[PDB]
């Protein structure tokens, strides 16, 4: 089935972001709740760009895809019928997956006016649950030599990648000249970051100019070599986390995790501003900034959107 990894592009390729707030910002209040150290209830706060109109809506269209995915009518449902389903109603949905054992929901739809290929992963049905029990497993990740990733990711991805890469593909075929683009809000960040590493190793016609990664609460996936490898492909990966939101800090990176993907920082909703660390790999200067003093609450809502429950 699935097309072979392609050598060229599976070729093996820092500092901890996170140590300078977790030095300046002392310690939190005895009443927060933590995990991995991060607060889970913390209730305040302890180059760089201000992001554009236009780059704030397109990060709020994939926010709306990524949380119209939690919509049972959507996934497995292959219908445009919820709250902020107006918005991407023109989609055809070509088709959606509720997997056995890892629970990975996910679609392809495809935009005939927006000449694009669009996947969409769903995060966890329990997610507050899912940020409780994470428990971080470095492995092996299997296409590049000498790189790691967290099992429960690969495991999520793993179970949906044949159908769904050769669904994609048969869409890319027939659209060559389509973008595809890849999305999802918390675990389907990390399934998604995945999937977009997938297409690119296995299809030569995708590349830097079709191919985009958009995330949206996304944990960290990989070590620093991963990392490395994430930002050799060239990939567009905007990563946005929403003000104090735990899960882009988890795990945290002094357990040895780093991210890749362009940061969209949300700072602030009234109104709308988004301010974007503009670095390839993670920095301290965007939400690194303010842990440990992170917050459950932050993850459920992105540009104004529920973000986990389709409400
Ligand atoms: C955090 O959650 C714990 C456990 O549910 C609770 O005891 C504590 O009051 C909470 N703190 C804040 C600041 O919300």
Same mark, same amino acid.
């Given at each position: 089935s699935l097309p072979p990894l392609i050598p060229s592009r599976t070729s093996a390729p820092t500092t901890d972001p996170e140590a300078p707030a977790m030095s300046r910002n002392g310690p939190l209040p005895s009443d927060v709740e933590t995990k991995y150290g991060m607060?889970?209830?913390?209730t305040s706060y302890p180059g760089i760009r201000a992001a554009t109109s236009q780059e704030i809506n397109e990060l709020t269209y994939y926010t709306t895809l990524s949380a119209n995915s939690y919509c049972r009518t959507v996934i497995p449902g292959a219908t445009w019928d919820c709250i902020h389903c107006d918005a991407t109603?023109?989609?055809? +949905?070509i088709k959606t997956w509720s997997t056995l054992i890892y629970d990975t929901n996910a679609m392809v739809a495809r935009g005939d006016s927006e000449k694009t290929i669009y996947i969409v992963f769903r995060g966890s049905s329990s997610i507050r649950n899912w940020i409780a029990d994470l428990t971080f497993v470095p492995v092996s990740y299997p296409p590049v030599s000498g790189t790691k990733v967290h099992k429960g990711f690969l495991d999520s991805y793993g179970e949906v990648q044949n159908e769904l890469v050769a669904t994609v593909l048969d869409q890319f075929k027939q659209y060559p000249s389509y973008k595809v683009a890849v999305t999802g809000h918390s675990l389907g960040g990390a399934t998604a970051l995945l999937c977009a590493l997938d297409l690119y190793q296995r299809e030569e016609g995708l590349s830097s100019s079709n191919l985009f990664l958009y995330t949206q609460g996304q944990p960290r996936v990989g070590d620093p070599a991963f990392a490395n490898y994430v930002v050799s492909t060239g990939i567009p990966y905007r990563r946005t986390v929403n003000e104090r939101d735990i899960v882009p800090h988890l795990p945290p990176a002094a357990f040895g995790f780093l991210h890749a993907g362009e940061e969209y920082w949300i700072?602030?909703?009234?109104?709308?501003t988004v301010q974007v660390c503009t670095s390839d790999l993670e920095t301290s200067?965007?939400?690194?900034? +303010?842990?440990?003093?992170?917050?459950?609450?932050?993850?459920?809502?992105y540009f104004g959107i529920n973000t986990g429950l389709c409400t």
């Amino acid at each position: 089935s699935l097309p072979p990894l392609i050598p060229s592009r599976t070729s093996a390729p820092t500092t901890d972001p996170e140590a300078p707030a977790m030095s300046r910002n002392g310690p939190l209040p005895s009443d927060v709740e933590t995990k991995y150290g991060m607060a889970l209830n913390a209730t305040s706060y302890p180059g760089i760009r201000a992001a554009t109109s236009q780059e704030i809506n397109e990060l709020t269209y994939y926010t709306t895809l990524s949380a119209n995915s939690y919509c049972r009518t959507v996934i497995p449902g292959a219908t445009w019928d919820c709250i902020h389903c107006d918005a991407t109603e023109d989609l055809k +949905i070509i088709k959606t997956w509720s997997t056995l054992i890892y629970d990975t929901n996910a679609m392809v739809a495809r935009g005939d006016s927006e000449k694009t290929i669009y996947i969409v992963f769903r995060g966890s049905s329990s997610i507050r649950n899912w940020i409780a029990d994470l428990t971080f497993v470095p492995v092996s990740y299997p296409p590049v030599s000498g790189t790691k990733v967290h099992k429960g990711f690969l495991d999520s991805y793993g179970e949906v990648q044949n159908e769904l890469v050769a669904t994609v593909l048969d869409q890319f075929k027939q659209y060559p000249s389509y973008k595809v683009a890849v999305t999802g809000h918390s675990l389907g960040g990390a399934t998604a970051l995945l999937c977009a590493l997938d297409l690119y190793q296995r299809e030569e016609g995708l590349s830097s100019s079709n191919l985009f990664l958009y995330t949206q609460g996304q944990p960290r996936v990989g070590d620093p070599a991963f990392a490395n490898y994430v930002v050799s492909t060239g990939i567009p990966y905007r990563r946005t986390v929403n003000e104090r939101d735990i899960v882009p800090h988890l795990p945290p990176a002094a357990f040895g995790f780093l991210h890749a993907g362009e940061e969209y920082w949300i700072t602030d909703n009234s109104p709308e501003t988004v301010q974007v660390c503009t670095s390839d790999l993670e920095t301290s200067d965007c939400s690194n900034s +303010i842990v440990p003093f992170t917050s459950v609450l932050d993850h459920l809502s992105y540009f104004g959107i529920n973000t986990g429950l389709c409400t």
